[PDB]
Amino acid sequence: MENFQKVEKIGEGTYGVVYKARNKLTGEVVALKKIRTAIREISLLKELNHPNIVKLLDVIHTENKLYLVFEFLHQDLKKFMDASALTGIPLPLIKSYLFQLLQGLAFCHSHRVLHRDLKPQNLLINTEGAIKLADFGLARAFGVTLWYRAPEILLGCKYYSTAVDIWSLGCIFAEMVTRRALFPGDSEIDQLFRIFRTLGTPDEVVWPGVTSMPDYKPSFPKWARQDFSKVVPPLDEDGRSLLSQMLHYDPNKRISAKAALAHPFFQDVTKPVPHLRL
Ligand SMILES: CCn1cnc2c(Nc3cccc(Cl)c3)nc(N[C@@H]3CCCC[C@@H]3N)nc21
């Protein structure tokens, strides 16, 4: 830690406190995360290299405490969404952000790395219009907002697939468009029933095997499904189609990141500049 200076606290991440730090030998400004089997597997994440993934620079194990050194970005998507809530993020920028996030997820999924806990606070942005995913692979290597959790997680499935990340990103997409969280649960059951009240209570027809899930209860409220045009207005039918595919209940059938990239919603994608106030 004497290898850094002006070490300054940004705030709480998922696994510990994130600091902004300046490296001694290089003058590099980095993000240093102090975390409250895992060493080798986190170390392997130093090999991931993609424009839409926050680079993991170094892993430091000292005094039985783990420090992860990452590339530094200046803002998260939560802050940007809050700053933009008056006016809304323009559609072309939502589109660009979604496209980029999908490309990051396509890459990680193709290397068998899941996120498992995507949320606007782990999506980081810069002045050039890039958005990047922070924390891939940490949940598996290591072994609180529920708002983005997939229904198979809430129903107690033990085996996690890449579909959980698509669900979370769909929730984020909806939130960028409406300005409000899609399923802001206050408890695990409230999270599940908010999903249920919007998308309808799942059944064997739309989700084979759901009623044998660990936490499934045959006494679960039987709500009808609502229309997407009620859920994410005034999003156009391309965007509503893609979101419907990202929020399919059956994880085997939820759209993949690769397939989502091909959706007609992205035919006119561009890369706008955000106006960031730093
Ligand atoms: C470890 C990867 N990593 C790289 N750059 C960051 C980073 N930059 C940042 C700097 C100023 C304001 C904001 Cl909003 C974010 N912030 C976080 N995490 C924060 C945890 C506290 C709340 C804000 C952020 N979510 N991690 C970063």
Side-chain angles (χ1 to χ4, degrees):
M1 201 75 107
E2 302 293 328
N3 345 49
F4 306 99
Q5 21 267 284
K6 219 143 194 287
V7 173
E8 107 139 50
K9 192 172 168 176
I10 308 172
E12 291 295 331
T14 333
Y15 300 96
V17 48
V18 184
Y19 302 88
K20 184 178 188 181
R22 177 185 288 93
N23 188 307
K24 227 323 290 150
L25 181 107
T26 64
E28 66 182 357
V29 169
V30 300
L32 245 170
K33 182 167 205 182
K34 179 189 200 177
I35 303 302
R36 186 43 271 126
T37 176
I39 300 301
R40 191 226 256 83
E41 50 200 345
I42 286 161
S43 297
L44 290 182
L45 305 174
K46 293 188 290 174
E47 259 100 317
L48 289 186
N49 169 88
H50 186 283
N52 301 117
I53 303 301
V54 178
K55 182 79 187 167
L56 174 57
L57 301 173
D58 276 301
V59 179
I60 306 306
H61 189 203
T62 196
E63 318 195 293
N64 303 314
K65 293 180 158 190
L66 203 53
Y67 298 87
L68 300 186
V69 191
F70 290 99
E71 86 174 275
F72 178 81
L73 290 91
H74 282 84
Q75 195 155 296
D76 68 12
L77 182 68
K78 176 54 175 353
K79 187 156 216 281
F80 185 70
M81 269 198 281
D82 284 353
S84 298
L86 9 43
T87 51
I89 302 169
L91 183 62
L93 183 60
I94 295 179
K95 185 179 295 193
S96 176
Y97 276 175
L98 184 63
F99 188 83
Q100 287 179 69
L101 290 170
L102 291 166
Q103 287 181 97
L105 282 190
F107 171 83
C108 290
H109 295 171
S110 73
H111 291 285
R112 297 162 260 100
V113 176
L114 296 201
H115 195 300
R116 277 157 84 134
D117 190 29
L118 289 165
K119 57 193 153 184
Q121 299 81 353
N122 58 35
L123 303 178
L124 301 182
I125 58 176
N126 69 14
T127 57
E128 297 193 280
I131 189 164
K132 307 189 184 201
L133 300 123
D135 296 351
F136 259 85
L138 304 181
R140 182 166 107 67
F142 288 124
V144 78
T145 192
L146 297 173
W147 297 353
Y148 309 96
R149 247 150 194 54
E152 60 273 27
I153 301 171
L154 299 166
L155 291 170
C157 302
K158 167 170 205 51
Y159 295 100
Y160 294 19
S161 85
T162 59
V164 306
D165 293 331
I166 295 288
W167 178 275
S168 303
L169 189 52
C171 293
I172 297 167
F173 176 26
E175 185 170 346
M176 288 193 279
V177 170
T178 63
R179 267 114 108 178
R180 284 179 89 167
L182 177 61
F183 299 131
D186 45 50
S187 67
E188 280 187 4
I189 200 65
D190 183 57
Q191 186 65 40
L192 191 69
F193 289 177
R194 283 173 179 264
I195 296 169
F196 287 7
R197 281 176 249 140
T198 298
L199 302 179
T201 299
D203 61 27
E204 285 300 326
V205 174
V206 300
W207 189 352
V210 67
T211 68
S212 294
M213 295 270 226
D215 303 326
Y216 178 91
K217 307 299 173 180
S219 60
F220 283 162
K222 286 216 172 40
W223 289 282
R225 183 176 178 92
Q226 304 196 33
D227 197 280
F228 263 112
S229 66
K230 193 199 159 171
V231 185
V232 292
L235 188 62
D236 68 55
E237 176 64 14
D238 282 318
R240 296 185 321 251
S241 171
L242 173 62
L243 181 62
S244 81
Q245 302 192 286
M246 298 179 77
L247 302 181
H248 189 75
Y249 273 120
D250 185 353
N252 179 249
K253 304 276 93 175
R254 199 174 297 146
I255 196 166
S256 67
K258 285 196 169 173
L261 290 165
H263 191 280
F265 184 64
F266 299 115
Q267 185 174 319
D268 68 347
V269 72
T270 64
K271 191 182 181 178
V273 176
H275 148 86
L276 301 187
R277 288 171 229 240
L278 303 168

